[PDB]
Amino acid sequence: KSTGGKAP
Amino acid sequence: SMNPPPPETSNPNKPKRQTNQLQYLLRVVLKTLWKHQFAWPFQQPVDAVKLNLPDYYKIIKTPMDMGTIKKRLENNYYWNAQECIQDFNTMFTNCYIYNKPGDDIVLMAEALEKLFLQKINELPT
Protein backbone atom coordinates (compact mmCIF):
# COMPACT_ATOMS: atom_id res chain seq x y z
CA LYS A 1 0.00 0.00 0.00
CA SER A 2 3.09 2.25 0.03
CA THR A 3 3.18 2.92 -3.73
CA GLY A 4 -0.59 2.18 -4.04
CA GLY A 5 0.03 -1.04 -5.99
CA LYS A 6 2.80 0.15 -8.33
CA ALA A 7 6.10 -1.64 -8.81
CA PRO A 8 9.09 0.66 -7.95
CA SER B 1 5.61 17.04 -9.68
CA MET B 2 2.21 18.38 -8.46
CA ASN B 3 -1.00 16.44 -9.16
CA PRO B 4 -3.50 17.70 -11.63
CA PRO B 5 -7.02 18.49 -10.48
CA PRO B 6 -9.20 15.32 -10.29
CA PRO B 7 -11.68 14.66 -13.06
CA GLU B 8 -15.08 16.48 -12.90
CA THR B 9 -17.71 14.45 -10.99
CA SER B 10 -20.47 17.10 -10.89
CA ASN B 11 -21.94 19.61 -13.22
CA PRO B 12 -25.50 21.11 -12.40
CA ASN B 13 -25.66 22.42 -16.03
CA LYS B 14 -25.63 18.88 -17.63
CA PRO B 15 -29.10 17.35 -17.82
CA LYS B 16 -29.97 14.33 -15.64
CA ARG B 17 -31.94 11.07 -15.86
CA GLN B 18 -32.21 7.68 -14.19
CA THR B 19 -32.25 4.62 -16.51
CA ASN B 20 -32.42 0.83 -15.94
CA GLN B 21 -28.87 0.71 -17.28
CA LEU B 22 -27.38 3.40 -15.07
CA GLN B 23 -28.91 1.75 -12.00
CA TYR B 24 -27.41 -1.57 -13.07
CA LEU B 25 -23.95 0.08 -13.49
CA LEU B 26 -24.03 1.46 -9.92
CA ARG B 27 -25.72 -1.35 -8.06
CA VAL B 28 -24.43 -4.38 -9.98
CA VAL B 29 -21.26 -3.40 -11.82
CA LEU B 30 -19.72 -0.78 -9.61
CA LYS B 31 -20.75 -2.58 -6.40
CA THR B 32 -19.22 -5.89 -7.47
CA LEU B 33 -15.90 -4.30 -8.55
CA TRP B 34 -15.89 -1.92 -5.56
CA LYS B 35 -16.02 -4.72 -3.00
CA HIS B 36 -13.33 -6.85 -4.82
CA GLN B 37 -10.09 -7.66 -2.95
CA PHE B 38 -8.04 -6.08 -5.82
CA ALA B 39 -10.16 -2.86 -5.93
CA TRP B 40 -8.05 -0.58 -3.69
CA PRO B 41 -5.42 0.66 -6.22
CA PHE B 42 -8.33 2.03 -8.29
CA GLN B 43 -10.73 3.52 -5.69
CA GLN B 44 -9.16 6.96 -5.89
CA PRO B 45 -7.18 9.11 -8.37
CA VAL B 46 -3.55 8.20 -8.57
CA ASP B 47 -1.84 10.61 -6.16
CA ALA B 48 1.64 10.90 -7.71
CA VAL B 49 2.87 13.15 -4.86
CA LYS B 50 2.14 10.79 -1.95
CA LEU B 51 3.10 7.69 -4.01
CA ASN B 52 6.31 9.14 -5.58
CA LEU B 53 5.26 8.68 -9.23
CA PRO B 54 6.63 11.75 -11.01
CA ASP B 55 6.13 10.24 -14.50
CA TYR B 56 2.45 9.24 -13.98
CA TYR B 57 0.84 12.29 -15.58
CA LYS B 58 3.58 12.74 -18.19
CA ILE B 59 2.41 9.31 -19.40
CA ILE B 60 -1.30 9.31 -18.43
CA LYS B 61 -3.16 12.33 -19.83
CA THR B 62 -6.75 10.94 -19.49
CA PRO B 63 -6.83 9.76 -15.86
CA MET B 64 -9.73 7.77 -14.42
CA ASP B 65 -10.45 5.79 -11.29
CA MET B 66 -13.46 3.97 -9.75
CA GLY B 67 -13.90 6.70 -7.12
CA THR B 68 -14.55 9.28 -9.86
CA ILE B 69 -16.88 6.86 -11.64
CA LYS B 70 -18.71 6.03 -8.39
CA LYS B 71 -19.30 9.78 -7.81
CA ARG B 72 -20.37 10.34 -11.36
CA LEU B 73 -22.94 7.61 -11.02
CA GLU B 74 -24.21 8.98 -7.64
CA ASN B 75 -24.44 12.47 -9.11
CA ASN B 76 -26.28 11.53 -12.39
CA TYR B 77 -23.34 12.94 -14.31
CA TYR B 78 -23.81 10.20 -16.97
CA TRP B 79 -26.78 10.31 -19.39
CA ASN B 80 -25.78 7.18 -21.41
CA ALA B 81 -24.41 3.94 -19.94
CA GLN B 82 -21.73 4.02 -22.62
CA GLU B 83 -20.09 7.06 -21.05
CA CYS B 84 -19.74 5.06 -17.88
CA ILE B 85 -18.43 1.97 -19.66
CA GLN B 86 -15.84 4.15 -21.45
CA ASP B 87 -14.56 5.50 -18.12
CA PHE B 88 -13.97 1.96 -16.84
CA ASN B 89 -12.21 1.13 -20.07
CA THR B 90 -10.08 4.25 -19.74
CA MET B 91 -9.17 3.23 -16.21
CA PHE B 92 -8.10 -0.25 -17.30
CA THR B 93 -6.27 1.00 -20.40
CA ASN B 94 -4.33 3.50 -18.28
CA CYS B 95 -3.18 0.75 -16.01
CA TYR B 96 -1.93 -1.23 -19.02
CA ILE B 97 -0.12 1.82 -20.48
CA TYR B 98 1.73 2.82 -17.32
CA ASN B 99 2.63 -0.46 -15.62
CA LYS B 100 4.82 -3.13 -17.20
CA PRO B 101 3.04 -6.38 -18.23
CA GLY B 102 4.09 -8.64 -15.42
CA ASP B 103 3.73 -6.08 -12.66
CA ASP B 104 1.21 -7.17 -9.97
CA ILE B 105 -1.14 -4.27 -10.68
CA VAL B 106 -1.69 -5.37 -14.35
CA LEU B 107 -2.67 -8.88 -13.24
CA MET B 108 -5.09 -7.22 -10.71
CA ALA B 109 -6.63 -4.86 -13.30
CA GLU B 110 -7.08 -7.86 -15.63
CA ALA B 111 -9.14 -9.75 -13.03
CA LEU B 112 -11.28 -6.67 -12.45
CA GLU B 113 -11.76 -6.22 -16.20
CA LYS B 114 -12.83 -9.85 -16.64
CA LEU B 115 -15.36 -9.42 -13.87
CA PHE B 116 -16.35 -6.07 -15.37
CA LEU B 117 -16.84 -7.65 -18.79
CA GLN B 118 -18.84 -10.54 -17.32
CA LYS B 119 -21.08 -8.04 -15.59
CA ILE B 120 -21.84 -5.63 -18.45
CA ASN B 121 -22.85 -8.60 -20.68
CA GLU B 122 -25.71 -8.81 -18.16
CA LEU B 123 -26.71 -5.14 -18.75
CA PRO B 124 -30.57 -4.88 -19.22
CA THR B 125 -33.35 -3.35 -21.37
Residue numbers in the entry:
A (entry chain C): 9 to 16
B (entry chain A): 42 to 166
Publication excerpt:
Bromo and extra-terminal (BET) proteins provide a recruitment platform initiated by the recognition of acetylated lysines (Kac) by their tandem bromodomains (BRD, Dhalluin et al., 1999, Jacobson et al., 2000, Owen et al., 2000). BETs, like all of the 42 human BRD-containing proteins, contain additional interaction domains that recruit other proteins to the acetylated protein target, forming complex assemblies and contributing to processes such as chromatin remodeling and transcription.
To understand the mode of engagement of a single BET BRD toward adjacent Kac marks separated by longer linkers, we crystallized BRD4/BD1 with a histone H3 peptide carrying K9ac and K14ac (Kac-X4-Kac motif) identified in our SPOT data. Interestingly, only K14ac bound within the BRD cavity, while K9ac packed outside of the cavity, next to W81. This resulted in an inverted peptide orientation compared to Kac-XX-Kac peptides. While K14ac superimposed well with K5ac from a H4 K5ac/K8ac peptide, the longer backbone linking it to K9ac superimposed with K8ac, sterically filling the remaining volume of the BRD cavity, and resulting in a small helical turn. Indeed, while both BRD4 BRDs bind in solution to H3 K9ac/K14ac, phosphorylation of S10 had no effect on BD1 binding but abolished binding to BD2, and phosphorylation of T11 abolished binding to both BRD4 BRDs. Phosphorylation on the longer linker on histone H3 (Kac-X4-Kac; the second Kac being outside of the BRD) affects BET binding, potentially linking cellular signaling events to epigenetic circuits.
